[PDB]
């Protein structure tokens, strides 16, 4: 009877009001987080091209944790994907907050990217 | 009650502004902080 | 003859403040020149156009001026360079 | 957890066997209860809205929220602000001690209590319940205020139709007027 908003449903109404603030690229592709219930991802995307430049996720058979879906050991992907684009060298990227709060352990993904090098 | 009163400096004693404020709604000696060019920084500016 | 009956109650008018397309579709346009005066956002800005305090449209980096459409009935000013 | 262990052991499969659903989790429950004062001091001239705080926190220790008037009224008092009545929209496990204080404890402290509200459902599943007395709830002190108010308590179900919800509440065991 009580109709609820899904945590994916209204989240992309909070995500697009970040998408009206940033340009995707500027030799600096945008970088979003996807916080599911089980395991949490990271892609490096840029408008105009829509090219996912380099990516990985917590779902990765290489470099498992193996606690898999908990605190900042699951932000090794925040450490990995910044090290993954480090061989592309690109860049001091733009960071999407998705539709989540930049709070930790969503912040801790992008925390792991900065001492992995990338300036944001 | 709306009266336009300058907001003078405290580092140098220098008026430098005009602000709109209300005699009833803001009865205190009101204070903001702004930029005095003769003091070159952020500066305590009370009403005068 | 005549009786003196008035009056009209409605004589007043504002100063006519101007709007409309100040440039065309295909103009070279210097930096910071006003493309299109608006009361509100009757047309939105796109590439290399800002928005004024009067919500006006003015081009930052020079080049051509294209009036476009969002979809379905909503226009969009973008500036493309040479 | 005495009501909470009641339906988590028997009641939810009892409706499944009464009439079917797929997915045994598809069963209506207790969702949320919104207690109300609605008072507004009658009419703002007490001035103690906040008298309704002390009267309400001992139904359950949930901190309440005074409901602010979202409209200006031409026939009474007042324009917006100056809130009208308190509210606890309680949930969870404190939910399942509020109702154990209702059925076998405080609902017989309604004086002429036999059974009630044949038609007070909202048509599609909510259960409304007006309350006219306040010696009812147990941790209310008779040494205290001795002033008379009224209440609503709005029990919310999960079922699409109150068909399924009314038969749920009878498996809960709610005394209705028959």
């Amino acid at each position: 009877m009580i109709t609820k908003t899904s945590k994916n449903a209204a989240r992309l109404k909070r995500h697009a009001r970040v998408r009206a603030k940033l340009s995707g690229t500027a030799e600096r592709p945008r970088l979003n987080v996807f916080r599911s219930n089980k395991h949490i991802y990271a892609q490096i995307i840029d408008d105009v091209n829509g090219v996912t430049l380099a990516s990985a996720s917590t779902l990765d058979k290489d470099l498992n944790v193996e606690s898999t879906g908990d605190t900042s050991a699951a932000t090794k992907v925040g450490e990995l994907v910044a090290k993954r684009a480090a061989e592309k060298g690109i860049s001091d990227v733009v960071f999407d907050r998705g539709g989540y709060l930049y709070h930790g352990r969503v912040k801790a993904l992008a925390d792991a990217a900065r001492e992995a090098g990338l300036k944001f | 009650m709306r009266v336009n009163i300058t907001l003078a400096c405290t580092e140098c004693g220098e008026r430098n502004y005009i602000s709109k404020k209300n005699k009833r709604n803001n009865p205190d000696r009101v204070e903001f902080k702004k930029y005095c060019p003769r003091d070159k920084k952020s500066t305590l500016h009370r009403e005068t | 003859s005549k009786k003196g009956v008035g009056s009209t109650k409605n004589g007043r008018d504002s100063e006519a403040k101007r709007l409309g397309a100040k440039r065309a579709d295909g103009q070279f346009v210097t930096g910071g020149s006003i493309l299109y005066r608006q009361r509100g956002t009757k047309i939105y800005p796109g590439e290399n156009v800002g928005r004024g305090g009067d919500d006006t449209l003015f081009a930052k980096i020079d080049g051509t001026v294209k009036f476009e459409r969002f979809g379905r009935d909503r226009k969009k000013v973008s500036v493309y360079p040479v | 957890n005495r009501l909470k262990e009641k339906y988590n052991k028997e009641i939810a499969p009892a409706l499944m066997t009464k009439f079917n659903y797929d997915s045994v989790m598809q069963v209506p429950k207790i969702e949320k209860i919104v207690i109300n004062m609605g008072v507004g001091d009658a009419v703002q001239n007490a001035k103690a809205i906040d008298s309704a705080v002390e009267e309400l926190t001992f139904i359950a220790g949930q901190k309440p929220v005074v409901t602010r008037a979202k409209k200006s009224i031409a026939g009474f008092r007042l324009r917006e602000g100056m809130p009208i009545g308190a509210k606890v929209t309680l949930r969870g496990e404190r939910m399942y001690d509020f109702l154990d204080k209702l059925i076998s404890v405080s609902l017989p402290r309604v004086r002429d209590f036999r059974g009630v509200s044949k038609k007070s459902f909202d048509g599609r599943g909510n259960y409304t319940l007006g309350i006219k007395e306040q010696l009812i709830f147990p941790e209310i002190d008779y040494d205290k205020v001795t002033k008379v108010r009224g209440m609503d308590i709005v029990i919310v179900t999960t079922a699409n139709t109150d068909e399924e919800a009314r038969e749920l509440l009878t498996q809960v065991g709610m005394p209705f007027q028959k």
């Binding site: - | - | 005549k2 009786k3 009956v5 008035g6 | -």
Partner: protein
């Protein structure tokens, strides 16, 4: 005798009547009607001069329809005063009549009653007319 209840404005432009009407060039509710032939303003009193002088001749008759309705205030400055100085007093009401618009509809009536009950209202209306009946396709 009809008037609009509460109009958005009390003094209005006079318009320019030309061409065929936007719609209602075809009697469709009842059986027989009059279709006008010229462009004119028809005042309030003339539809009052119609709904009376048809029910003279329609002693036991059907319902009389009127598809016209007045909404335009024809406007007079008070007489024997100079030009200008404000737009005048709203003198009453006046309807919009393009040519070609079927004015009335009359039902429950045969041919021969409708050729005189509808004729005599056309002597009161200031426009040359023609009788118009229905048609199926359809």
């Amino acid at each position: 005798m009809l008037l609009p209840k509460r109009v958005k404005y009390r003094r209005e432009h006079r318009g320019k009547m030309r061409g065929r009407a936007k719609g209602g060039t075809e009697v469709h509710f009842g059986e027989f009607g009059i279709q006008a032939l010229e462009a004119s303003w028809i005042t309030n009193r003339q539809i009052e001069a119609a709904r009376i002088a048809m029910t003279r001749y329609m002693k036991r008759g059907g319902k009389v329809w009127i598809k016209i309705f007045p909404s335009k205030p024809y406007t007079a400055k008070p007489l024997e005063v100079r030009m200008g100085s404000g737009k005048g007093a709203p003198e009453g009401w006046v309807a919009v009549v393009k040519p070609g618009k079927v004015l009335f509809e009359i039902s429950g009536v045969s041919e021969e009653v409708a050729r005189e009950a509808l004729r005599l209202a056309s002597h009161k209306l200031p426009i040359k007319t023609k009788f118009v009946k229905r048609e199926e396709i359809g």
